[PDB]
Every structure is written in C-alpha cells, then in structure tokens.
C-alpha cells in the first residue's frame, strides 16, 4: 500500500501573509506534521513535529516535566485543541532522546507507529548543515495564542522571514546570543508579535514542492517581536544525529 510523502499537505495551507497582526487560524489539517505534546492526563504544554511514523522532534526543555516517557502522550491530526476531531491519534511515548552537543532539541519515539493519513504526515528534514538563506519565507504553527471568539483552541500560523545569523546577532537585535546551531525569523525595526508556535513546535519553509522543517521553536525564545526575532534550533545541524538515533533505537 502506498503512503503520503513528507512535507506535502493534502489540504493547501492558508499561508497567512507576512506582518499580519494576530496572524491567522490555519486551514484544518494543512500542517499534518503538527504535534501536540501532552501530559498523561491530557494537558497540552508543548508542540512538536512528526518526522517519521515513530518519531517526533520537539524541544529539549519540554522534557523537563518528567523523566519517564510514560508521562508523555502525543496528539496527531488535530486542529481544535479541546474537542479533538474523531480521527485524531493519541500515542504514548516510549523512549526519550536528548541531543548531546547543544541539548536544545529532543527526539521522542512513539510506543506504536502513527498511522499516516491525509491528515497525519511527517515533515521533510533538510540536507545536513543546510543554511536557510536570508529573507526566506517560512511559517510557524501552534496553539500558543488563545485567540478571541473565532480562533480559540484552533491551530494558528504566522509567516516569518528568516534573518541571517550575522544580522540577527547585532547589538540592537539579539546581541550575539545566537549560536550557529540556531536561526532567526522575524521582523526588524517594525513588525508585529508572533507567538503562535508552541515551544518545540515547527518552523517550516517551502522549497519547490514540499515544506522543510528548518527549525524547532526554542523554549521561551520563540515569540518573534520587533527587533527581537524568535530563535529556533537549526535543524540542518542535527540531521545526522536524528538519523543515527532513529537507526539505533
């Protein structure tokens, strides 16, 4: 039986225009790799990205809740946060892996493989050490902002242009706090606050015919605000690590 390919949504994303105040509510299931990391009891506190039927990439500090993978549950295929659609998959995490060198991202292996459908599809990973070019248009997705009457509990998205690290590190911006293993996306000398993405959530950028997971929202530093772009872990620098872990576990 054939399956669905990474990074290609079956529901065309809305693609919220840039610099839109409050961002937009996404089209249901247009971000198929969007994961909701939740406690055993069912409380959403972090986001993540399905990268393979059995693996979800999230932010390292998201694992600060508990050491036992049994305390974690993965929610897949959702749009509405509370009254989950009927097809939503809830899968308990069985193993946890922290990235050794920088310790900003973590891998979560699911107790059973997620079923890939038209609403549950992994995002594609980038070629090792790829550096996203300045100005590149990307999107961040998540349930970070509780909207008003018309978006509460709905998956939201915001388009953010990536900001070259050299520039991002300037004094008036992030002042040298940005490592090569990190990247910036945001607005300088203006813009609007984009807090939609959950810590651990995805930063995807389109490339020819698919959405590539270039970044992982960094715990606490992911909100993009004027002169203080969001900070995301640079996925391309951990691709080799990711493949090895999946290969060895």
């Amino acid at each position: 039986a054939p399956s669905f390919d990474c990074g290609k949504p079956q529901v065309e994303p809305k693609k919220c225009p840039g610099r839109v105040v409050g961002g937009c509510v996404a089209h249901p299931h247009s971000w198929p790799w969007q994961v909701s990391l939740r406690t055993r009891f069912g409380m959403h506190f972090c986001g993540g990205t399905l990268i393979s039927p059995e693996w979800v990439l999230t932010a390292a500090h998201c694992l600060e809740k508990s050491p036992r993978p049994s305390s974690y549950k993965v929610i897949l295929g959702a749009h509405q946060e509370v009254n989950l659609e009927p097809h939503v998959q809830e899968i308990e995490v069985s193993r946890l892996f922290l990235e050794p060198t920088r310790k900003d991202i973590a891998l979560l292996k699911l107790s059973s493989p997620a079923v890939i459908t038209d609403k549950v599809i992994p995002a594609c990973l980038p070629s090792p050490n790829y550096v996203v070019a300045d100005r590149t248009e990307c999107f961040i997705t998540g349930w970070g902002e509780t909207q008003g009457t018309f978006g509460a509990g709905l998956l939201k998205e915001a388009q953010l242009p990536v900001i070259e690290n050299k520039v991002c590190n300037r004094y008036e911006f992030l002042n040298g706090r940005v490592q090569s293993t990190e990247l910036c996306a945001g607005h300088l000398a203006g813009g609007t606050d984009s807090c939609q993405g959950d810590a651990g959530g995805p930063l995807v950028c389109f490339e020819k015919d698919k959405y590539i997971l270039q970044g992982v929202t960094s715990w606490g530093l992911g909100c993009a605000r004027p002169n203080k772009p969001g900070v995301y872990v640079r996925v391309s620098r951990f691709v080799t690590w990711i493949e090895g872990v999946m290969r060895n576990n």
Partner: protein, 112 residues
Amino acid sequence: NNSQLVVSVAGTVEGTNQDISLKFFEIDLTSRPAMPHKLEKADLLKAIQEQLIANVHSNDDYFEVIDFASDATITDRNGKVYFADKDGSVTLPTQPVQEFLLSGHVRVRPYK
C-alpha cells in the same frame, strides 16, 4: 424590544500595522423572518463590509473585509466571551433579551 449585537470594531490593513476606522452600528437578533441568535462568521463580516462601502467618505477608501483579527470577541454585559463552533458559528442565548458586543479588529486589504 429585542436582543441586539453592538458592532464596535476597527480595521487593520493586512501586512501592515495601520488601523482604519469603521462605523459602529447595531444588528437586531430574532427567531427568523436583522440576524439569527446563531451568528455566522461570514454573515457578520459582510455586514461589516456593506457598512464599510456605505460609509466611504472623501478620505477613507474602499477596503475588502477579509476575516476577523485575533482579538475579535463577542461578549455580554457580564464580560463573558462566546466562542464560535467548528463551523465558525456563534450561538448566543435567546433569553433574557439583552445586548452583546462584537469588538476587536477586522483584517482588511485595499481594493485595487
């Protein structure tokens, strides 16, 4: 008389930080022949659209209402916020007869 929706919102030009002024009106709420107590996202927006093109002065230009901004809410005198369902519908109580407020911003793009 009958419950009504006080529409008091503002516009924000998409892709920018500039706000636009919009005339605030009222919408009556009834059973069915003016709008139902079960409001439709799309209906509310066109009401705002019509109103917009009807109040275009010499300065203010024509803008297309696109959607509600993230801060838009419909509330009652107790400050209670009503939330739209999966289909974008907002169902307000029939009793008592009362007032509801629809405030916040509307995403608009210039007609050109």
